Amino acid sequence: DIKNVNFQIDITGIWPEYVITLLLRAINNGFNTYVSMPNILYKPTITA
C-alpha cells in the first residue's frame, strides 16, 4: 500500500534480511516509489 515515498538508504551494508524483501516488494507491487542510494560505487559501460 505504499503510495508516494522515497527511501533514502545510505550504508547499503547492514539491513538484516527483512527490509531487503520489503524494499524489493515495494519497488514491485507498488504505485509510485523510489529507492535512492547515493553511496553505491559502480563502473558504467555505456553502449548502443
Place this chain on the structure above:
Amino acid sequence: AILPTIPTTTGVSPLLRIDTRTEPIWYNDAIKTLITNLTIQYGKIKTV
C-alpha cells in the same frame, strides 16, 4: 572494535557477533548497549 589487523586462528567471543545480521537482532542490540561504556578491541594494537 576490530583493528585493521587480525590474528589468523580466531576466537569465539560473543563480542564477534555485534552489529552483524543473521542473529536475533535483539541480542546484538543488547551487547551493543552493554559495551559502548567499556573499552574493547580486537587484533594487534601496538608493537613495542
